[PDB]
Amino acid sequence: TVFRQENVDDYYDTGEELGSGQFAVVKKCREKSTGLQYAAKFIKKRRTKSSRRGVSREDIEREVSILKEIQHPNVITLHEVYENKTDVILILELVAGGELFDFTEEEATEFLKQILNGVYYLHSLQIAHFDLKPENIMLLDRNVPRIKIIDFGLAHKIDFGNEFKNIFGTPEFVAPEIVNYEPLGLEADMWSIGVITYILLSGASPFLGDTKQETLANVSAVNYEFEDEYFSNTSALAKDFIRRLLVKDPKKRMTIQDSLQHPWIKPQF
Ligand SMILES: Nc1cc2c(nn1)-c1ccccc1CC2
Secondary structure (H helix, E strand, O other), rough: OEOOOOOHHHHHEEEEEEEEEEEEEEEEEEEEEOOOEEEEEEEOOOOOOOOOOOOOOOHHHHHHHHHHOOEEEEEEEEEEEEEEEEEEEEEEOOOOEEEEHOOOHHHHHHHHHHHHHHHHHHHHEEOOOOOOOOEEEOOOOOOOEEEOHHHHHHHOEOOOOEEEEOOOOOHHHOOHHHHHHOOEEOOOHHHHHHHHHHHHHOOOOOOOOHHHHHHHHHHHOOOOOOOHHHOOOHHHHHHHHHHHOOOOHHHHHHHHHHHHHHOOOOOOO
């Protein structure tokens, strides 16, 4: 699929940098025709088929295709796509409030519930995000707060219940099936939600070791505990919620629908 080949600079003006990835940079921008503001994500293209630098056209198109499908208040929307020789440029909704963690159980669940609603929408569409972590939970406007899940760079449509292709995010947040290079499904997202919840409530990371290999070993082993010093005041129900997500066997882990009915919620190298 081909994208808009006119110079993006003829239609938008860029401003402050908003964030980045390995082969991407995101800048605030303003559309010349309307004055509406967006975030322009410049994704570096691969220069050759054997290159390890840049993002493959296949991967870029998958992210674009997923973003086009979704319309939900808790997920980032895609406005337009441009491209040139070096970059594909996604014109995305402006999420200007920064990362959630930068910004009590009631406060934690208020944000957690919006994450759950957004993931419920995704999973309803058989879309696994595969990269859920605090850095990808943004606040639309931290001055009003509504969250927006961002960065669909690892996201996949799961049409056969699982995907088998060495998908791998950030060691602290990936499920044991990712660490062990096994078939992956929506369940992996639910693990990552348990990790996010643990950190939300405690400011501590459940599996984090001193090196990447230690973190990964800890994840695979389900080597974590609710440290009394960090969780003394936290309700048993909150811990129960987390415990049912941080389960090695994906089949035994709470689903997104389970998480919404849970008594706490219900009203790599
Ligand atoms: N890797 C990243 C990183 C970011 C974003 N997307 N991908 C983003 C998208 C829309 C608005 C704001 C951002 C900030 C950081």
